[PDB]
Every structure is written in C-alpha cells, then in structure tokens.
Design a protein around this ligand. Sequence first.
Ligand code: KLI
Length: 555
Amino acid sequence: SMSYTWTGALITPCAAEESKLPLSNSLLRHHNMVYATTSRSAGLRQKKVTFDRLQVLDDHYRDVLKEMKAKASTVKAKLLSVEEACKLTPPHSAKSKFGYGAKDVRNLSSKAVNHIHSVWKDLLEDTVTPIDTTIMAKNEVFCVQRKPARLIVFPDLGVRVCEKMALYDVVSTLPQVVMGSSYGFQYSPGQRVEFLVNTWKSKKNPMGFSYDTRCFDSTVTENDIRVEESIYQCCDLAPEARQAIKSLTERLYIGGPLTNSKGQNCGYRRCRASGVLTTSCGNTLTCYLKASAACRAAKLQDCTMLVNGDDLVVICESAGTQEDAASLRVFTEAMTRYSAPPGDPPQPEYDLELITSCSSNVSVAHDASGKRVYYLTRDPTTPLARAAWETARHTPVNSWLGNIIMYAPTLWARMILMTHFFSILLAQEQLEKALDCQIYGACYSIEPLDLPQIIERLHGLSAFSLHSYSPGEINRVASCLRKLGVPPLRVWRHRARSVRARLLSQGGRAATCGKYLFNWAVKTKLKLTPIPAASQLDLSGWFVAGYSGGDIYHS
Ligand SMILES: CN1CCN(c2cc3c(cc2F)c(=O)c(-c2noc(Cc4ccccc4)n2)cn3Cc2ccc(C(F)(F)F)cc2F)CC1
C-alpha cells in the first residue's frame, strides 16, 4: 500500500510566502544562510514521503502489544464537554469552512457549538465516510547545509474540537501509563537529563544509540493506526467515546482525501496525518511498540527506551564493540520489517554526551561551588536562525522564548538569546507584554518577566551560575557563531552588562531579570538566593504530554 497517491494538483499557499531574511544584523550578519521553506518545494517533499510500505510482524511484536494493552486496560478516560474542548482551541487556530472561527469557538457562540454538535452526531451515526483534510506546506526557518517544506494534514475546525472531546483525556493520560518512564513528554528538560544520566549510570557497561526513522509519518500503516485504536479501546470508556474513537479512526486517522488551499483534490492519504490530536500519542505508542519488539529480536540486554513521537533513543548493556555493531544491524532489520526503516543507520555510542535525541544532548557544566551539573543542550544553529527571523519579522510563534525556557542553562541561550531579546524588549518597552510560545506542541502565553522563577523552577538556581562548560560544547557553539557570523562573547558580555544595568534601574521583576539572568556578565557576582515567587508558580500541565499538530492551547 502506498502512503500517498496524488492527482497532480499542486499543494498551494493560502498567503504570500517569505523565504528570505530581510537589529537582526546585530545578532547575525550572514543573513543569506537563513531561509524559510515555502510551497514551492512541496513537490520535493511529496516525492520523499511517497512510497510503498512493507510490514511483517512477529512474536516479539505481538508480545509487546499484549503487554501494552494490559497496561492500557488500567486507564479510565473521560469525554470532554463541548465547552472544555472549545477552551483548548488556540485563538488563532484555522477557521472552519462552515462559517465560524476559533474566536467563535472560544466564545462558545451558538453557531459554532451547534455545528460542533452536528459533527459529533454525524461521527456517531456514520463510521465509514472518509473525512476531508487540508494539506499545506509548512513555513519553517532553517540555516543552509536546503530542506523542502514539511507537509501538514489537518481536518476542519469542527472535527478538531470533536477530537478533543473524544480523545483529549486519552492522549493526555494513556501514554504515560502504557510506556512508564520511557514516555518522553512527561519530563521537563532537567528531568529528561536526570532520567538519561541515571539510566546511563545504571548500566554495568552502557551502550546507546539514537534511531532515526526515515519519514516516520509515511511509515505508519493503516494496520498501525488500527492497532493504536485497539490500545485506546482498552481504556475504560463511555459507549459514546468508544463510538467516536472508532469513527475518527476509520474516517480520519487511517487516511482520507487531501484538499489544497484552493479546494482542489490533491490525492489520498493512507498513513499518519501530521495535524490531528492523536499524532504525537499515536507516533509515540507506535515507535515504542516497534522499537521494544526490535530490541527483543536483536537480543539487546536490559534495553531502556526514551520515546518522543518518532524520536527514539535506546540505552542498553554493551556486549562488546563488535557484538554491539552487529546487534544494532539486527535491531535495524527488525524495525525495517515493522515498516520503520532508518534514515541514516544508527551507530553505537559509549559516551552519553554524543547521543543526540530530540535534536538535543546531555552535557556537563559546573555550578558556583564547582559541583558537576548536567543540562540539556543542542546545536544552536536553528534556534539562532529562527531568532534572527523573529527579530526582523512579526511572527505569532516566538521560538526564542521557548528556547530560553527549554535551554536556559546553556551558554548560547544565556549569552545570546537572553541578551538580544531582553535588549529589544527594553527598547520597545514591551517587558510586561505576554507572548505565545510552544512547549511539546502545546501553545502557552508567557510573560518574559517571569523567566527567572520559571527557570529556577525548571532548572534550579544553578542555571544562573553555570560555568566551565565542556570544550566539545563550546567548540560547537563557536563553530556555529563562525558559520552564522554572530558576535563573540566579548561583544555579548558588553551588551549584557548594558541590558542588565537598565533592568536593575526599573526595579521590581525587571531588576530580578537583570540580577539573575545576567549575573554571568558581571565580574563581581551578586549572591542569588531562591526567588520566593518561584514556589507559588503553577507549572503543572507543562510537561505531561506531547501535542505537536494537535491544535492545543493552555492557560
Ligand atoms: C579549544 N577550546 C576553546 C574554548 N574552550 C572553552 C572556553 C570557555 C569555556 C569552556 C571551554 F571548554 C567556559 O566554560 C566559559 C564560561 N564559563 O562561564 C562563562 C560565563 C558565561 C555564562 C553564560 C554565557 C556566557 C558566559 N563562560 C567560557 N569559555 C570561553 C569561550 C570561548 C568560546 C565561546 C564561543 F563559543 F562563544 F565561541 C564562548 C566562551 F565563553 C577551551 C578550549
């Protein structure tokens, strides 16, 4: 079965697309290296993601599936009311083709609610007719060496709300129960590091590897998608939920027709849709299932998995370098049979720091006392490129804010992102202005002035005093700054001292940002005690589940 079939109709934009970087130069001067993907490259992506999938299952697969269902059976899940579902809808979510928008949904306008009721009722009465989806090219920023745009497939606003009602509770609670500690989205960055470091430490003689499935969404078969449903259905559910879940699966999740922005039929999908509520959960369960089975086929000893959607990292007991090399090829052959072939082949690693998963890795620094501290970091190229874009253009999603929150302990986030953006917020007098950012796919509204206590709550006080970073980490940053033409430490330190001073003179939370975020920039350090406001912060539903493509909004 083909993941996609196409009519020949083009994937079209719904607005003018910028692929070019037009204050921003002060951040990064090699602006010709920064580009954004557009629909013009859609054809290239279409070719990559269109192929025949072959799948052969074995006893290991079946044993693991049985084990997952058994745990899934302990879960009780609730229907969301229409109101609860509406409030989860982002204010700028794509409007319905049926005469109402996200604002109408959020306001609970009777037109929107009446339509949502009719969609739900239709779901219960009809469990066959494929549901329409829109296919678009994503507009994302990168640095050269060029990626063709990613494709986004999503149903109408009315359907998405119904998805929330039927499955939000399921995709928010089920994965963690089924996969336990292996479920990646339950962790803040600090917690993700702790689990990785400790898992590594716990092996007698550890070996680990990241596994990249080539175009994971396309590798997901209709069988895979029904297997996921069978897992959902193990939950203790209301008869209405079971019916809706079954209808959504047959009518939307397993596949359906693709319609472009102009309304033309572009083709038909028979794999994972990137823009539905179950994408993250489905991908995570499916990746976990196949990888767990593959471990057994490959006879990897004491396999420990960490899974985030299609992102997979494995840490096990080494059986020797040659033996490991051979075991990994077997693991890969098993994954391939399950319809999850690798992009670039996995390779054994024997240094935790060298394992990149979720585009990030663990590294070491030292706190004020000289004590060792592990933190999550990544190559800063993309974050910096997108930071430049967001400086030179108005964008609804502030990746820089999300990056500061997730990578606050890193040298590059502290040195560059905090300095550059707080300087801009000072000039524009928009310190008090709340901004939208994404965490694990979900959209959050956050006040930049709260960053100190947010960071203390997530990464601890040491985040404000990390030094003596690894040479490997610094070389990567330096190499990146060279590549992108970014000013060196001496320049950012000078800028940071200026911003820090200006922040202090405003007092209040502003001064707190100056004192904590920029203590690194001053030669005589302040004392930095626990921020009292860091305790009374509501940081519960931040790191519970993934929702990439799931159209979720919180707070
Ligand atoms: C061959 N290798 C070359 C470099 N290598 C290293 C250089 C380092 C550090 C560790 C290294 F191994 C380190 O640990 C700190 C530091 N610690 O504490 C703060 C304070 C601080 C905190 C937060 C933000 C900024 C400064 N800065 C500073 N530098 C100097 C440095 C060089 C290059 C870059 C950059 F990458 F930008 F080119 C940035 C740097 F800082 C050793 C030998």
